[PDB]
Enzyme design. Structure first.
Site, PDB file in Angstrom:
ATOM      1  N   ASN B 158     -30.485 -92.342  29.037  1.00 56.51           N
ATOM      2  CA  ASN B 158     -30.860 -90.931  29.122  1.00 56.51           C
ATOM      3  C   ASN B 158     -32.106 -90.652  29.965  1.00 56.51           C
ATOM      4  O   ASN B 158     -33.022 -91.471  30.063  1.00 56.51           O
ATOM      5  CB  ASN B 158     -31.056 -90.356  27.703  1.00 56.51           C
ATOM      6  CG  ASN B 158     -31.574 -88.906  27.703  1.00 56.51           C
ATOM      7  OD1 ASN B 158     -30.886 -87.979  28.148  1.00 56.51           O
ATOM      8  ND2 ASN B 158     -32.793 -88.713  27.194  1.00 56.51           N
ATOM      9  N   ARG B 163     -43.583 -84.142  28.022  1.00 58.84           N
ATOM     10  CA  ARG B 163     -44.948 -84.181  28.536  1.00 58.84           C
ATOM     11  C   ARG B 163     -45.684 -85.356  27.911  1.00 58.84           C
ATOM     12  O   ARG B 163     -45.465 -85.686  26.744  1.00 58.84           O
ATOM     13  CB  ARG B 163     -45.677 -82.881  28.238  1.00 58.84           C
ATOM     14  CG  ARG B 163     -46.015 -82.667  26.795  1.00 58.84           C
ATOM     15  CD  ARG B 163     -46.396 -81.218  26.575  1.00 58.84           C
ATOM     16  NE  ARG B 163     -47.016 -81.021  25.270  1.00 58.84           N
ATOM     17  CZ  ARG B 163     -47.166 -79.839  24.691  1.00 58.84           C
ATOM     18  NH1 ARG B 163     -46.734 -78.746  25.308  1.00 58.84           N
ATOM     19  NH2 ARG B 163     -47.748 -79.758  23.503  1.00 58.84           N
ATOM     20  N   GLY B 181     -31.750 -86.963  23.016  1.00 57.76           N
ATOM     21  CA  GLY B 181     -32.328 -87.685  24.137  1.00 57.76           C
ATOM     22  C   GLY B 181     -33.081 -88.938  23.745  1.00 57.76           C
ATOM     23  O   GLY B 181     -32.622 -89.714  22.909  1.00 57.76           O
ATOM     24  N   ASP B 273     -48.349 -74.090  26.519  1.00 56.34           N
ATOM     25  CA  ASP B 273     -47.038 -74.270  27.162  1.00 56.34           C
ATOM     26  C   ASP B 273     -46.445 -72.964  27.650  1.00 56.34           C
ATOM     27  O   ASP B 273     -47.162 -71.965  27.728  1.00 56.34           O
ATOM     28  CB  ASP B 273     -46.038 -74.976  26.243  1.00 56.34           C
ATOM     29  CG  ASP B 273     -45.904 -74.301  24.919  1.00 56.34           C
ATOM     30  OD1 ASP B 273     -45.190 -74.845  24.044  1.00 56.34           O
ATOM     31  OD2 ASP B 273     -46.525 -73.224  24.758  1.00 56.34           O
TER      32      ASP B 273
END
Lengths: 474, 474
Positions: B158, B163, B181, B273
């Site tokens: 994957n 971050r 993931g 973010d």
């Protein structure tokens, strides 16, 4: 396999067919016998002694999920899932031009469905044992038979199941409820060639595949007949009509050719349908039969609709088994997806998923009311976990009652689209839907200690599972 | 085309790239320059004089929909639709066994990403010009770079965008928000081989395709790298790592190899973010870099997140252009589907359909909150007709205000799943959604005479459309 006849010889061998040589009246008597029959499993019925007719009446053909499955070259209700996988795959056959650099209809010349023919002057529909279903029904009504029509510009043709009322020695009523299928080809032909009669043909008693193909919804990327080929295994054998270019299955038992006189309409007298109530009179186009073609010793295939369990109701249960995989591919959390007949085949659905986060139930909810078009009118959806049998009301009611807080766990959304005939709604074509999730509540959804559910021991359920037959309890 | 370098030479030719040879500090100064730049169109920026570092910092690469499109071998924002068509088709490649009877990764031996290498004893991450984005940010944070991991039993690997906080000369924090993931491969490896270190690799500055491939969501019926091949046109050239079997793109600019020490975690200090607010401290796994491999004269690719318009925000606008066709194939009534950045890339969506029956708006509503997984958290949906520009707030507000009755035309559904970080919700991971259809009301939806909307003349809008440039108004 190839035609209806072969399907009946197969069923009769497997004890799935019964012949009522006793005198029976197609006027609401056949329904009664069929109703009881279907209400208890029962085989397909073939009345070869209809009071006042020479054509044996065949009904309750798909009166069992088993028989529906078989009719699709699967012989197993479960196999229907494979048909769902296929349907999904058929939707996207080829890629876009950008990244692209990396089952025909066998038309015959002759056809058994054209062995016997009568036209115009003498096309008495009264010779056909068309049956009346309920005491307050308007008149005899053709219930099966796929209506074939073609657009004013599209080469492809459509197969439709529209009930047809007997209003004359050669006039039927074409009840195109939907705004699609044959109804669309007509309102379209009227544009392209106003005033000119619209060609129409109805095929009664075709091979189970062509029939079931007409029933199951297929992507516009494939012709109805084509799909039937995959199901059947071999390409479907069609044949040109007499008074038009439409193509009807060559093995059909009876075929009705004719037209629809622009503007000509007629009030479709009351009729009771799947809901279990009588439909109120309404106007619809009138089909003029100019030609009746049939086989030698042809049998009349017919059915009926009423309070479910219904002949179509069971067909729908069998057909919902195919949507499950199409539904799962989209929502992998869905374990089982079921729509009980009692709920009129589509008015209610029970979904059981593997809840993986708070609020999850609402997603499957929206999912059901939007994903497929065959579930846009269902106004009741119950979401449950994988430890409940969606097909067992005892399990579902248990869930609703133990893991749910009415006000808290019920989702009501108003002014959604709804069936024009659902009289129970506040306004025709507009109503509300209710979603009730009875899934175990997770922290956030609740602040209380949720109950530890009783889970049966797999090995025990497995042991008594084997010794079960030895235990002659029943 | 083949690697990042080639993409930048292309952009620099097309005036889409600018080189800031002036001295700039990667400590929140680059963000400021990038922010203003992105807030006004602006080209990708390449700072080759970062204060205190030898590596030029490359950012705002996909700061325009045009450049995002180009990065996918399309050079046209519209072309993205073709990528949607492809994505749809890739989902169902082959049919079930029942009816079945009717782009590999080029691994190299050598790789420019392994031209320069340092390991263990000397793997100072302080040499890399990792940038700090906002004044209250915890510490330098790697923002791009695809994290590569492999399951404890699945051969497939994957690509993830997580971050990474700088907590040491060779320790980063692995922020696997999702439950899928890389986060899944880790909690899975821990099972299969408890205690044993989990292999992990991060590739910084890979070809735009591998990058965009990692961004766009692809069906599990295809490997991330594979998809990149279709986009790029040619198979993606990967290369074996040094301390593990993972495969990273050979043209990558910098590659970080290392592991994750089971149990080792660290508090991911505050960070601002996409929402435009600072994230609160939270614990996460800590990545140990045992190897840093890079190219000769390698450039550091980096970005940032803050109040939108954001570098990722625009990427999302470009990425939503691909979902449109995937959305339309399901709901042919959908004309345009848009998610404004101001709404944090996914918190709000405007849908414009061709209403064909009362209550229709509600269907597209449920549709949006259930169909694709990338729209399950959006809590605002506005449904409009095709005579309004979904991308023009003047049109949308007009619709809301002229063809809508608040109480009557608003749909509120509670306890739906919502982003764990959406502090505005009553409870973490649980909140409500609001659907407001501003579609013209049809009889049933209303009992009043609806207004006749002003429709511009196609020929006029067409005439002044040509004479427009001649009219030197601006």
């Amino acid at each position: 396999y190839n035609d209806l006849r072969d399907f009946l010889t197969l069923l009769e061998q497997q004890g799935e067919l019964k012949r009522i040589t006793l005198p029976v009246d197609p006027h609401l008597e056949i329904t009664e016998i069929a109703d009881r029959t279907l209400r208890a499993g029962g085989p397909a019925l073939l009345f070869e002694n209809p009071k006042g007719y020479s054509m044996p009446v065949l009904c309750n053909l798909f009166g069992t999920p088993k028989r529906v499955a078989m009719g699709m070259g699967q012989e197993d209700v479960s196999a229907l899932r494979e048909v769902g996988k296929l349907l999904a795959f058929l939707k996207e056959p080829e890629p876009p031009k950008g990244f692209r650099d990396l089952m025909p209809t066998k038309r015959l010349r002759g056809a058994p469905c054209q062995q016997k023919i009568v036209s115009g002057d003498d096309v008495d529909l009264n010779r056909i044992p068309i049956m009346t279903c309920w005491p307050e029904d308007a008149a005899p009504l053709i219930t099966w038979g796929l209506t074939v029509t073609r657009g004013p510009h599209k080469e492809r043709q459509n197969l439709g199941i529209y009930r047809q009322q007997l209003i004359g020695k050669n006039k039927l009523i074409m009840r195109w409820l939907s705004h699609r299928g044959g109804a669309l080809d007509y309102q379209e032909w009227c544009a392209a060639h106003p005033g000119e009669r619209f060609p129409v043909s109805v095929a009664l008693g075709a091979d189970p595949a062509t029939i079931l193909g007409a029933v199951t919804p297929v992507p516009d990327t494939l012709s109805e007949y084509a799909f039937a080929g995959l199901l059947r295994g071999t390409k479907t054998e069609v044949v040109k009509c007499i008074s038009n270019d439409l193509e009807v299955p060559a093995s059909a038992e009876i075929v009705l050719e004719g037209y629809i006189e622009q503007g000509e309409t007629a009030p479709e007298g009351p009729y009771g349908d799947h809901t279990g109530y009588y439909n109120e009179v309404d106007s619809f186009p009138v089909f003029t039969v100019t030609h009746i073609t049939q086989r030698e010793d042809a049998i009349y295939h017919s059915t009926y609709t009423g309070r479910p369990p219904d002949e179509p109701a069971v067909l729908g249960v069998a057909l919902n088994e195919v949507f499950v995989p199409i539904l799962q591919k989209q929502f992998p959390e869905i374990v089982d997806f079921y729509l009980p007949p009692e709920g009129c085949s589509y008015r209610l659905a029970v979904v059981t998923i593997k809840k993986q986060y708070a609020g999850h139930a609402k997603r499957v909810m929206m999912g059901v009311w939007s994903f497929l078009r065959q579930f846009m009118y269902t106004k009741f959806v119950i979401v449950c976990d994988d430890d409940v049998n969606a097909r067992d009301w005892n399990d579902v009611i248990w869930a609703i009652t133990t893991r749910m807080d009415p006000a808290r766990d019920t989702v009501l959304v108003e002014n959604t689209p709804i069936d024009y005939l659902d009289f129970a709604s506040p306004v025709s074509g507009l109503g509300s839907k209710m979603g009730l999730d009875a899934t175990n509540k997770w922290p956030g959804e609740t602040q209380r200690e949720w109950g530890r559910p009783i889970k049966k021991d797999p090995d025990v359920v497995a042991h008594i599972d084997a010794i079960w037959d030895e235990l002659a309890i029943f």
